[PDB]
Symmetry: C3
Subunit: 231 residues, 3 copies
């Protein structure tokens, strides 16, 4: 395990996701409100899935070698397995907060699936120049998602409770900033142009992942917006 310099960040990531999972699990024990239960379920599952995939990367299972540029390049494929399930759960948290219509939710989840799926294909593609074609398609799917979060959701939040409108606005802003960093790190890291070494890349993704999951969850689950308006 320690044979890879990036192991320290995989281990820290595993620990922080594990701790985040346990914290949300305990916190949600005292919850009976049916609406709050939905948000706790979604939000606890996110770091639990990430915990398993960080562990698989730490132990070496979630790593494969991909030939491109005349080299055997270490590619952590387990990231995409994580993201396939956790990024639509994160979007679902946002969509339920603002009572999004079903068509909009399906558009978001579908675009998200395309985003992660094409990122996976790009990560595993052996023809170097083609990796960036997949990156571009994935990034276009991301831009669609960000567009919807701003010009379909923000003006939906404003007709809702003030506490859900303010909580949505904060989580929207956190999401757009954090999620936009992922394609940049991929592009300059070992999957793309290879300018930033894998150990630093792994650190960067770990900070983004913990912030986008445990950070996000801490903000959401401390808000009164997750509860039905009750006396």
């Amino acid at each position: 395990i320690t044979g890879r310099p990036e192991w320290i960040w995989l281990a820290l990531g595993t620990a922080l996701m594990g701790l985040g999972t346990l914290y949300f699990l305990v916190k949600g024990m005292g919850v009976s409100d049916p609406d709050a239960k939905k948000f706790y379920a979604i939000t606890t599952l996110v770091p639990a899935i990430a915990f398993t995939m960080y562990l698989s990367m730490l132990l070496g299972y979630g790593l494969t070698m991909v030939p491109f540029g005349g080299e055997q390049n270490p590619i952590y494929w387990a990231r995409y397995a994580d993201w396939l399930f956790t990024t639509p759960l994160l979007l679902l948290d946002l969509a339920l907060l603002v009572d999004a219509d079903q068509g909009t939710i399906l558009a978001l989840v579908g675009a998200d699936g395309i985003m992660i799926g094409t990122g996976l294909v790009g990560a595993l593609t052996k023809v170097y120049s083609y990796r960036f074609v997949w990156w571009a398609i994935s990034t276009a799917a991301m831009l669609y998602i960000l567009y919807v979060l701003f010009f379909g959701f923000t003006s939906k939040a404003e007709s809702m409770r003030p506490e859900v409108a303010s909580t949505f606005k904060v989580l929207r802003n956190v999401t757009v900033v954090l999620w936009s960093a992922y394609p940049v790190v991929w592009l300059i890291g070992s999957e793309g142009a290879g300018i930033v070494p894998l150990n630093i890349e792994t650190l960067l993704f770990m900070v983004l992942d913990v912030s986008a999951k445990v950070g996000f969850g801490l903000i959401l689950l401390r808000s009164r917006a997750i509860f039905g308006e009750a006396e």
Copy 2:
């Protein structure tokens, strides 16, 4: 890319799915009705997914070699990845049109999953005679789906709005004819008996795919059946 004679049909397929995706995306921009949004979301996602998988076939990612009959046989596995997601979306379009009950929808999607999954296993099976066992099981799942579309849905459409009944009937008929061709092409093509060469097989699937997705979508999204009855 041009090293494979079937590349021209993969390229045309990619282009037509891409163009179809953009057309539906633009067309649905001016839509606020919650019901119509569902149909636009579902129907736009279908060629978008197909676009990505056609591209993966064009670039060579979605192709593998399978030993059977003492030969290395080129198998485009990306078709099944496409179909796994797009065929239940197509069925969902039909089921929502007639306000199908939840049990019926689950039966359809489940049978569809079995249909595509067993087709994939058959496509990748190395014992030649066993490929046709999987083809038979998949075809039985197809026949179940077609049965339900006729003797569970058609008489559901007739108690609904005339515009939804007439639109459903047309899309049902398009679906049954087009979908029934797929097992025949598989059986006589490079996956099955090998009587029709891969380049012609690829052409045939491209015509079926564009018709079943973009053709289907053009009929559906031009109907007033996708809108709630409103003043």
Copy 3:
């Protein structure tokens, strides 16, 4: 096929799932009640999926070799493909019976996904001692599911119809006993410590699978709890 001593149990399993599938399919033909249709759909799909995966194991497709302990160890990976889809369907049968809230259903299905997914990783892991780390995480996800079935569902059933409360209690008890055997068989069988040989392991899983699917389904589909209260 007969080259593997466990083939007889794979063949019997295939037959019993096939027969169970046909029986439930015929039985549900005379059903119009929308609630009952849901239970028939879910419950018929379960042995149908299991039939396909038992067949893939019989024909040899669903088997791979995994190096650990200095040996090539036969691992039937198709079990996890089965279980990935059938165990959440089984939980859905239980959850719908007691009209579980959406948050609880998502927690169950999510924990179940983690349970099966980590079992799959453990089954395919090449470092022997690490296989048991994945077994432990999977078992913890199982224990969560069993906890919810007892201390979240049982007291939900009691405020419902007596026929649904009594049917739920029986199916809950069947589920907890049968499902708890699976991690034990894995641990002592060819995936784990290797004390029980593969042919006996295969027998054990076949008895558990038929009981947990066809047995379970026979109890559920003969109950009046699956019908809406109607005059």
